[PDB]
Amino acid sequence: NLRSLETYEADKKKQVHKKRKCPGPIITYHSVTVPLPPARCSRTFITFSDDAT
Amino acid sequence: RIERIGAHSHIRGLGLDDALEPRQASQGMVGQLAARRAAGVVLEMIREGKIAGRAVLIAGQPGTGKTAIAMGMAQALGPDTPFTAIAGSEIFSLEMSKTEALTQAFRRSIGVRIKEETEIIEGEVVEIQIDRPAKVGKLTLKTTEMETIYDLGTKMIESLTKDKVQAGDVITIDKATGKISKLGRSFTRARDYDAMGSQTKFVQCPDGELQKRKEVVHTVSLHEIDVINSRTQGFLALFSGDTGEIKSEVREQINAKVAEWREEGKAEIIPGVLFIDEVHMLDIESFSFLNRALESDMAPVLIMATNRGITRIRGTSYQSPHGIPIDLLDRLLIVSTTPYSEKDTKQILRIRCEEEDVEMSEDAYTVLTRIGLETSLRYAIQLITAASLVCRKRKGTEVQVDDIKRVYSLFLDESRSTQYMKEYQDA
Numbered sequence: 001n002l003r004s005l006e007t008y009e010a011d012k013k014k015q016v017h018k019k020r021k022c023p024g025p026i027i028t029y030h031s032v033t034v035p036l037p038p039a040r041c042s043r044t045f046i047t048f049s050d051d052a053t
Numbered sequence: 054r055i056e057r058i059g060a061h062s063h064i065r066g067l068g069l070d071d072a073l074e075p076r077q078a079s080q081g082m083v084g085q086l087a088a089r090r091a092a093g094v095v096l097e098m099i100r101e102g103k104i105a106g107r108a109v110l111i112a113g114q115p116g117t118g119k120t121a122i123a124m125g126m127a128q129a130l131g132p133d134t135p136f137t138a139i140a141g142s143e144i145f146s147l148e149m150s151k152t153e154a155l156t157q158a159f160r161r162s163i164g165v166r167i168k169e170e171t172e173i174i175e176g177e178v179v180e181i182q183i184d185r186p187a188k189v190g191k192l193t194l195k196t197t198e199m200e201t202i203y204d205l206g207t208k209m210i211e212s213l214t215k216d217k218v219q220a221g222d223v224i225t226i227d228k229a230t231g232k233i234s235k236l237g238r239s240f241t242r243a244r245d246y247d248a249m250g251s252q253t254k255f256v257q258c259p260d261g262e263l264q265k266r267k268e269v270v271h272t273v274s275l276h277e278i279d280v281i282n283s284r285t286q287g288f289l290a291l292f293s294g295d296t297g298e299i300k301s302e303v304r305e306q307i308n309a310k311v312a313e314w315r316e317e318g319k320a321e322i323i324p325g326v327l328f329i330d331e332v333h334m335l336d337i338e339s340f341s342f343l344n345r346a347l348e349s350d351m352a353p354v355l356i357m358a359t360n361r362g363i364t365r366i367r368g369t370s371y372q373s374p375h376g377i378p379i380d381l382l383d384r385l386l387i388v389s390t391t392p393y394s395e396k397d398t399k400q401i402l403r404i405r406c407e408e409e410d411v412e413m414s415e416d417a418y419t420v421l422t423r424i425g426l427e428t429s430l431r432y433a434i435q436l437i438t439a440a441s442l443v444c445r446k447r448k449g450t451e452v453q454v455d456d457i458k459r460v461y462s463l464f465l466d467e468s469r470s471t472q473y474m475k476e477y478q479d480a
């Protein structure tokens with residue numbers, strides 16, 4: 001534990017902070033490659049935070 | 054692909070050997086070894102470009118191949134070197150003086166290859182998850198040998214939103230400016246949407262994640278002056294000829310910055326050629342300008358053609374050989390073109406027939422060579438075309454004597470036109 005503390009002298013925390021700053025009704029455009037090089041295709045998703053949007 | 058064969062389409066270069074020895078028939082040319090060797094050596098000089106302000110005058114009788122050898126040199130020069138072909142009567146513009154048009158033509162046949170270091174990131178967008186507030190985003194580029202995820206910024210996210218980039222799109226993002234350039238797609242889009250059907254492009258380079266020093270050579274002519282003369286330049290570079298810009302601070306400054314670029318390694322100068330066909334149409338003022346304009350270091354190689362002997366110079370009363378003042382005529386060196394013989398005429402006619410994809414009998418070739426030696430060569434080509442058409446109409450396979458002899462009476466030559474012209478139609 002002492003070595004860990006001395007060596008600690010995170011990006012995920014900054015992303016969580018960015019999320020905090022988000023008012024809350026954030027819509028995310030997300031598209032990912034999915035299978036049907038190997039045969040595959042692209043799929044699109046759109047996540048809505050709250051029902052208001 | 055649909056471009057019809059013209060009068061000078063049969064020629065496709067200047068037939069020359071390793072030692073510049075002219076050949077009888079090659080690359081669509083025939084005979085005229087002296088003028089062809091002169092063309093070859095002046096083309097070598099052009100491709101060298103070490104000296105500026107050299108002029109050559111192609112003189113000879115009509116039908117000797119002046120425009121032919123000019124187009125042959127133009128073709129042999131090949132791309133990457135500008136070849137500005139212009140007629141003597143094109144300098145007369147109602148919005149720009151003759152000297153201004155000549156300056157434009159001179160600077161238009163000079164090129165500068167501008168080197169530009171670029172840093173482009175490319176790959177396959179596996180994930181373009183963007184969190185729109187209505188600020189946060191990440192891009193997952195994939196290559197055939199490595200992958201990397203990049204945290205996207207606000208402006209980069211906005212740029213990506215501008216140019217719609219779905220998962221699986223092959224894009225080439227410039228790290229310098231962030232311009233979104235889509236090249237294609239790597240796979241279909243879910244096979245479910247009843248729309249947006251296209252073809253899939255090949256995968257990207259394995260090291261496409263970050264190309265460090267992609268070198269792109271932007272080539273532009275010295276006509277870039279149009280980019281400065283007015284705040285809006287596209288109008289002048291595309292259609293507007295009213296470009297009476299100020300010579301001071303534009304010509305001198307552009308030349309100075311071009312010299313600075315050449316000294317600092319940014320760009321390199323590539324002098325082209327300016328071919329003025331029927332230069333005898335130039336006014337004596339234009340000749341006086343060429344006399345001095347031909348002395349600048351940025352002066353291209355000025356090739357000219359004249360179809361006259363002793364003739365009056367336009368804009369004055371006294372006469373000079375080739376219709377050119379004694380000064381400019383003496384400055385340049387002249388390349389005389391000797392007329393073609395019967396064998397050369399027959400060979401040129403055969404080459405033209407091969408170009409037009411038309412076939413005719415041996416007697417047809419002989420009689421047509423005779424007619425061409427009598428009337429002219431271009432008229433012989435006109436008769437070639439007419440007889441080919443008459444044969445096609447006749448359902449024949451090749452043109453016989455009875456078709457050339459028929460089109461000879463159907464279409465008249467100037468020599469026979471003036472003969473039948475004795476009816477004093479008008480004067």
Ligand SMILES: Nc1ncnc2c1ncn2[C@@H]1O[C@H](COP(=O)(O)OP(=O)(O)O)[C@@H](O)[C@H]1O
Nearest residue numbers: 060082083115116117118119120121401430431
């Ligand atoms: N060496 C040549 N080979 C093939 N065709 C020629 C040649 N010389 C002249 N001609 C033909 O003669 C016609 C006019 O000659 P051109 O090539 O324009 O020389 P000029 O400029 O002296 O008239 C053109 O239709 C051209 O095809």
